[PDB]
Design a protein around this ligand. Structure first.
Ligand SMILES: [Zn+2]
Ligand SMILES: [Zn+2]
Lengths: 206, 199, 473, 65, 452, 101
């Protein structure tokens, strides 16, 4: 019960903070060679797809008005697998289709960020622009300067939250800090299986 | 096949039922709805051997669990009043006697606290309490696969209009019941044909 | 018993109802069940604190069986002898067994522990200048032996051929003989600079077996059994490198002698000038003060009129006090004069390496008298699940005998019946189908048959090569 | 179109070959042979045949002590 | 299983006896609890309105996804004679049984129930200390008698005749011992509620004498299901037939009595378990060396395991045993099939064996996902060995009958063989050998065919 | 639903779709652990009337770390099951609605 009280103490920070209800979430899922690592049962890529399916279900259960698109990073390219729409069934079918294919390649954060920037451009001003990047690898290869992309995302009020799989990547931390107005808490790294479940369940809140 | 839990949220208010008695030709409709509820609970307990019954009353000054009794009250008790005949089935008899005893106690409390008129209906809080009890019976999991069902016996009687403060708690109860797959049946006794929130 | 009321369901138990042992309140953590009838120990592997008891049982007990869930061990005298030798005192074993068992340790089991553990290390066999001396630290133990008196601080010389009789007689008495070689403190025998090459890695089960052999810092004569291909030869090399004395190795075949010489010159830093082979072609011995000699059981134990060179080499082997003997395939040691190779060679430490420690006669139980106690059992499922040995799918194909073949099977003598049940055509069809199926899978297949005529007939019918005794080399 | 008192038995050719030696040993075991799988055992000894069959096949079964 | 057996027994009850059975409200309530949920829903919606309800209206209740189940419910109400059909105005009108409806309404609302639920005498004892112990004592006594273990106390001759005249538990007087049948080991398999039900329906099958009335037995069984444990009830409401069969279950263990022919009787836990239900003891570990480590301390599980396991040692927790060839031969000589033994070993399997089988199947699916395999909780080697011992028991099967041969014409042989095939008694025929064989029961038919 | 209208580019939502996100706008304050020495209002729970147990963690624990969770407005007592159920599935305190405001 002392550990339970420490758990209860962390819940004492209750504030009626204003949150963006209407959201336009872009889920970026890694599909690289590092997705073939078997530290996560049974492989990394299948678990991320299944938990993304569960995340889509929970997000559309709790945020119905919010729209969502799915982008993967594969072979150095950003592949948009489901357009930004309010129907969760299309995203579920897209994730089920991606589950069959084998991940490969060296991921490109800049290509995914540019594709999401193109996707979030017709989003209205009242609808918040958020990107969720499930980054599995530790290094990324970009065709250009990623700092210009970060500055453009900051100028377009797009907030990026990155869940990393292996370690704390500096460019992801810098991107989260720049997009979240200096908040370094939006870069999250798991510890075990249930921590990944908790981190996926944390992102459904606005 | 699978036993279920019937949680009854009855809205007994002395102001609400008096308006229904004045509008109707008959008087004392509380007794009629109570005995109909008692026969319905005996019917539900006859459906399966392992089903359970919860009854919660929402009165003017708050809510109170009619059945089962409070564990402090159960430990304190037992004056077997003769409201219900003792020759019936004991499983029905215990539930009926407990229910009518708690009706007696709650109406004595209402008679004692009749001087204060409350403008805050407690039906939504009673539904929330019933949902907590339903989760407890599911969470407790003493019995495999208990299912569940809320039944709200409310009365409008053409006096209580639509209550805008109830909107968010009723919606939250809807989402909670959808999460736990608990159907909510509603019986409304009164002249108001349309009740938008309960519909 | 403990005044336990007998239930009607205990009728068919032949005094094996152990319900009088009161169950402990904290039993669920304890993974053992001690049977007072025979000292048999029942271990649950799936519980916590199982391996911390499994090492204790494999040090103090002999495993009867090791299935997946429930393991069955035997508390025996020889296991307790190795238990006390590696430094486990008597009270520690009783305290740990009391702490790690659900049922209480019965007084019969405790008395067995005291009886087998005490009176150990009293009588010792030592070798001084190629002469066997039995030695005891207490005086009256010499005077209580008046039956098997083979006499020829407190010690008397026994004959070299009579050492086995002394070991049997002292095992019958409550004073078992201690056979340990203190090679660290032994200076009469000249040392060897033999040591393992740094590039050679040793697997953990081999390390565990050698820790059973060299637990107390003194080499203990005994038997090690490992699966074929698990590296028993490397265990022999490492034991020779640990003792660092003159080594004699006995094998069953000349090709085994060649393989042992190759393994010695490969895994350890032994020069070929320190290695000698006693075979028919090669009879030159090493000229140094210490070294390795490898030979066969048959030539060493040859009672026939051997050649002059072989007689000179045998005189060299007998007149030299050896510090270590490695008996490969020790299951053939209990034979008639393969038994005598421990008598004709004065060796301080005797390690018997085998894979098949069974014989159809009871003389396989004589190796504790010949070599020493069974030091280590390899768990073949534990090695198979770690990839050290193959995961074999053992099977037994039932081939029905045909009508005309089975009629002749019953009207015949057993010697002809043996030939007749081999050559049933359904076995031909089954063998042909299995050969075809496993050849399509791309498998190297060996078909074993002890009958030479059946081997030739199957090979001629199926168009495959056959190898038997009369085939040229 | 005549009637006898016998019992028809189903067996594999191995057991068929086994019970003919029972006929060669004891006369009143089988009356006549029908097929390679159907035999006609006298019903007064069938259980006795059973009582020897497991005894006859006991030599093919290894029983640990 | 359980509901099907009592449903089929109530089908065999005649309609007038069935309507006479609906007098007591407790019987009607206990019968109503057996019905399917759609049938129970239709009955409960149909009791409180006195007017008859059309069948087409009941058809509109059910959605298209459960319509077939609706028919099944109707079939149950077409089997138990609760719904009376009527042909009126071109419609198949449905009316409720009046006695059943009145008794169910009296059970629900309360009123005239003619003491069908008994009267509480307010004097009581501890259920777990005495009532659970007495019922378990009698049940363990009869079960230890029927499994064949020696007992210092044997049950009375009322249940010995019950076991003798039943299909299970055959008895022989030439030796002096009792032989368990296949149905006996079947009875040891399922849970105790349907065991009690099978026993009670067999007792109902035996009762034909004028000493005992069938409707009173059914009423008493259903009110015993209605009675609650921990409170005694008075004997005065029962008849003398009900009194002697109350003494019969006092011997059997469904009811407790302080003394013989007492004024009160105590219901047991088996009375409430008669209606519906609600590592463990007897959990076992099977290894490749046929060693059984059965975590059992109750003598019942040890006794039923001794039927096919050569027991070696007994601890407080398990019984160290081994599945030997001789023990399985003992089990098969009692008619206990190998499938029953394998099912028993599956149902009592340890959770650790289940975890190992789950891990093996998880390694299998990630290796060969093209095919799916059943969860073999116990090793397949011992299953194959059990089935092999079953096969070596039945290497020969002996059919006794008559063989007809010595036909001078093939047409007569063909006519007799096709007649024997038409009457379904032929087992083998051959025109080349001119022989055809018939069974023992089919001899006389061919005899009167040939003689006439 | 909820989707944009394909014929006039208008959002089409229900009342429940707006209702699903109200609980973020007025989240409940977390319930406070009751003191051990403080006199408890009810021996059982309020939301589900579960009896709070003897709660003797050790031999002389008495009612230490009592499972009642006092609300900040209605001061009602909730067990740990009710506390985690309101933190996960419900989003409204029954005691705050039973109060006759
Ligand atoms: Zn609660
Ligand atoms: Zn509150």
């Amino acid at each position: 019960i002392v550990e339970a009280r420490k758990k209860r103490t962390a819940k004492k920070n209750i504030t009626p903070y204003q949150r963006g209800i209407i959201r336009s979430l872009i889920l970026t899922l890694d599909c690289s060679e590092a997705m073939l690592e078997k530290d996560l049962r049974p492989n990394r890529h299948a678990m991320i797809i299944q938990y993304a399916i569960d995340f889509v279900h929970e997000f559309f259960d709790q945020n119905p008005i919010s729209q969502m698109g799915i982008i993967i990073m594969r072979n150095g390219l950003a592949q948009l697998v489901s357009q930004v729409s309010g129907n969760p069934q299309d995203h579920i079918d897209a994730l089920k289709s991606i589950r069959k294919q084998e991940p490969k390649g060296n991921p490109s954060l800049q290509n995914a960020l540019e594709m999401a920037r193109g996707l979030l451009l017709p989003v209205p001003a009242h609808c918040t622009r958020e990107v969720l990047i499930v980054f599995g690898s530790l290094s990324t290869t970009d065709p250009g300067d990623i700092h210009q992309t970060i500055d453009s995302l900051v100028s377009e009020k797009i907030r990026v939250k990155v869940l990393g799989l292996s370690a704390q990547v500096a460019i992801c931390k810098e991107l989260c800090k720049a997009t979240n107005y200096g908040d370094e808490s939006f870069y999250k790294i798991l510890l075990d299986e249930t921590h990944l479940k908790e981190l996926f369940n944390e992102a459904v809140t606005p | 096949e699978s036993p279920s839990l019937l949680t009854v949220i009855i809205e007994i208010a002395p102001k609400l039922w008096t308006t229904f008695d004045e509008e109707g030709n008959e008087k004392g409709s509380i007794i009629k709805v109570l005995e109909a509820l008692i026969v319905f609970l005996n019917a539900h307990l006859a459906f399966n051997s392992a089903n359970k019954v919860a009854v919660i009353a929402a009165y003017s000054q708050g809510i109170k669990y009619l059945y089962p009794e409070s564990t402090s009250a159960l430990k304190a008790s037992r004056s077997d009043l003769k409201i219900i005949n003792s020759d019936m089935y004991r499983r029905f008899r215990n539930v009926d006697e407990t229910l009518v005893e708690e009706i007696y106690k709650l109406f004595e409390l209402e008679k004692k606290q009749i001087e204060q008129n409350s403008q805050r209906s407690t039906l939504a809080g009673a539904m929330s309490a019933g949902l907590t009890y339903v989760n407890r019976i599911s969470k407790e999991s003493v019995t495999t696969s208990l299912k569940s069902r809320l039944l709200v016996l409310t009365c409008g009687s053409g006096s209580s209009k639509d209550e805008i403060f109830q909107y968010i708690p009723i919606m939250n109860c809807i989402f909670s019941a959808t999460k736990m797959k608990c159907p909510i049946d509603v019986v409304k006794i009164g002249g108001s044909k349309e009740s938008t929130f309960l519909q | 018993p403990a005044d336990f009321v007998p239930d009607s369901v205990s009728g068919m138990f032949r005094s094996h109802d152990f319900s009088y042992l009161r169950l402990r309140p904290d039993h669920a953590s304890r993974p053992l069940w001690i049977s007072p009838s025979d000292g048999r120990i029942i271990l649950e592997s799936f519980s916590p604190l199982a391996e911390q008891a499994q090492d204790f049982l494999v040090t103090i007990a002999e495993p009867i069986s090791r299935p997946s869930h429930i393991h069955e061990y035997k508390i025996t005298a020889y296991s307790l002898y190795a238990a006390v030798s590696v430094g486990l005192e008597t009270d520690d074993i009783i305290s740990v067994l009391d702490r790690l068992s659900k049922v209480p340790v019965a007084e019969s089991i405790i008395n067995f522990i005291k009886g087998a553990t005490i009176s150990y290390g009293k009588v010792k066999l030592v070798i001084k200048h190629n002469r066997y001396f039995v030695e005891t630290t207490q005086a009256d133990i010499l005077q209580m032996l008046l039956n098997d008196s083979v006499i020829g601080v407190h010690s008397f010389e026994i004959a070299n051929e009579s050492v086995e009789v002394v070991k049997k007689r002292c095992q019958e008495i409550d004073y078992p003989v201690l056979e340990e070689y203190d090679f660290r403190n032994d200076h009469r025998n000249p040392d060897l600079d033999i040591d393992l090459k740094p590039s050679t890695q040793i697997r953990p089960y081999q390390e565990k077996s050698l820790s059973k052999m060299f637990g107390n810092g003194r080499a203990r004569s005994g038997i090690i059994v490992l699966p074929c291909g698990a590296g028993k030869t490397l265990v022999g090399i490492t034991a020779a490198c640990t003792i660092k004395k003159s080594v004699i190795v006995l094998c069953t075949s000349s090709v085994s002698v060649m393989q042992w010489r190759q393994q010695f010159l490969q895994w350890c830093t032994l020069q070929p000038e320190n290695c000698a082979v006693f075979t028919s072609d090669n009879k030159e011995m090493f000229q140094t003060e210490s070294g390795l000699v490898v030979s066969t059981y048959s030539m060493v134990a040859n009672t026939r009129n051997r050649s002059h060179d072989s007689q000179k080499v045998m005189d060299f082997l007998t007149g030299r006090e050896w510090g270590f003997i490695i008996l490969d395939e020790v299951h053939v040691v209990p034979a008639a004069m393969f038994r005598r190779v421990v008598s004709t060679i004065a060796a301080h430490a005797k390690l018997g390496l085998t894979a098949t420690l069974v014989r159809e006669d009871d003389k396989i139980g004589d190796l504790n008298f010949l070599i020493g106690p069974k030091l280590y059992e390899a768990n073949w499922m534990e090695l198979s699940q770690k990839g050290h040995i193959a995961n074999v799918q053992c099977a037994e194909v039932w081939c029905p005998m045909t009508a005309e073949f089975y009629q002749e099977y019953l009207r015949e003598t057993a010697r002809k019946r043996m030939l007749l049940y081999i050559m049933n055509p359904t076995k031909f069809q089954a063998c042909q189908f299995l050969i075809q199926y496993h050849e399509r899978r791309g498998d190297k297949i060996i078909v074993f048959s002890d009958n030479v005529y059946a081997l030739q007939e199957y090979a001629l019918k199926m168009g495959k090569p056959f190898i038997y005794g009369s085939t040229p080399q | 179109a005549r009637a006898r008192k016998g019992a028809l038995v189903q067996c594999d050719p191995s057991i068929k070959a086994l019970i003919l030696q029972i006929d060669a040993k004891m006369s009143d075991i089988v009356l006549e042979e029908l097929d390679d799988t159907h035999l006609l055992v006298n019903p007064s000894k069938v259980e006795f045949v059973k009582h020897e069959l497991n005894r006859l096949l006991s030599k093919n079964i290894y029983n640990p002590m | 299983s359980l509901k099907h057996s009592v449903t089929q027994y109530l089908e065999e009850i005649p309609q007038q006896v069935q309507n006479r059975l609906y007098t007591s409200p407790a019987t009607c309530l206990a019968i109503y609890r057996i019905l399917p949920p759609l049938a129970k829903f239709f009955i409960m919606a149909m009791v409180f309105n006195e007017n008859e309800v059309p069948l087409l209206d009941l058809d509109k209740w059910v959605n298209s996804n459960g319509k077939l189940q609706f028919q099944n419910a109707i079939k149950s109400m077409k089997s138990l004679h609760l719904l009376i059909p009527n042909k009126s105005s071109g419609t198949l009108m449905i009316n409720l049984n009046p006695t059943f409806k009145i008794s169910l309404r009296n059970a629900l609302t309360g009123g005239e129930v003619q003491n069908s639920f008994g009267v509480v005498v307010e004097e009581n004892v501890v259920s777990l200390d005495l009532l659970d112990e007495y019922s378990a004592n009698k049940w363990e006594t009869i079960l230890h008698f029927m499994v064949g273990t020696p007992l210092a106390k044997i049950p009375s001759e009322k249940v010995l005749n019950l076991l003798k005249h039943s299909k299970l538990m055959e008895e022989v007087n030439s030796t002096g011992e009792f032989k368990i049948t296949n149905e006996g080991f079947q009875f040891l398999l399922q849970e105790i509620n349907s065991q009690l039900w099978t026993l009670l329906l067999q007792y109902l099958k035996m009762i034909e004498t004028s000493k005992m009335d069938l409707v009173d037995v059914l009423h008493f069984i259903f009110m015993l299901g209605a009675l609650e444990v921990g409170k005694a009830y008075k004997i005065d409401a029962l008849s003398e037939t009900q009194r002697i069969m109350l003494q019969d279950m006092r011997d059997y263990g469904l009811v407790f009595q302080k003394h013989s022919n007492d004024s009160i009787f105590y219901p047991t836990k088996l009375a409430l378990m008669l209606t519906s239900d609600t590592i463990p003891d007897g959990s076992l570990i099977v290894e490749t060396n046929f060693k059984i480590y059965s975590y059992s301390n109750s003598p019942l599980q040890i006794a039923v395991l001794s039927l096919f396991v050569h027991l070696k040692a007994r601890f407080v927790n398990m019984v160290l045993g081994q599945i030997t060839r001789e023990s399985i031969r003992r089990a098969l000589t009692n008619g206990i099939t190998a499938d029953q033994i394998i099912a028993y070993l599956e149902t009592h399997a340890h959770p650790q064996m289940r975890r190992l089988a789950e891990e093996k199947l998880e390694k299998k699916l990630e290796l060969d996902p093209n095919c799916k395999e059943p969860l073999q909780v116990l090793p397949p080697t011992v299953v194959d060995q059990i089935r092999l011992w079953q096969l070596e028991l039945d290497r020969v099967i002996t059919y006794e009958g008559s063989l007809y041969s010595d036909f001078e014409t093939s047409q007569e042989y063909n006519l007799l063989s096709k007649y024997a095939q038409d009457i379904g008694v032929l087992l083998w025929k051959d025109d080349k050998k001119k022989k055809f064989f018939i069974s023992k029961e089919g001899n006389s038919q061919v005899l009167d065919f040939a003689k006439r | 639903l909820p989707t944009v209208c394909p014929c006039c580019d208008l959002m089409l939502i229900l009342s429940t779709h707006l209702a699903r996100s109200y609980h973020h706008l007025m989240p409940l304050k977390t319930f406070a652990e009751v003191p051990t020495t403080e006199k408890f209002r009810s021996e059982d729970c309020f939301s589900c009337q579960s009896r709070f147990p003897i709660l003797k963690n050790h031999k002389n624990g008495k009612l230490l770390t009592s499972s009642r969770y006092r609300c900040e407005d209605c001061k009602q007592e909730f067990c740990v099951d009710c506390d985690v159920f309101i933190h996960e599935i419900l989003h409204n305190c029954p005691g705050c609605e039973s109060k006759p405001v």
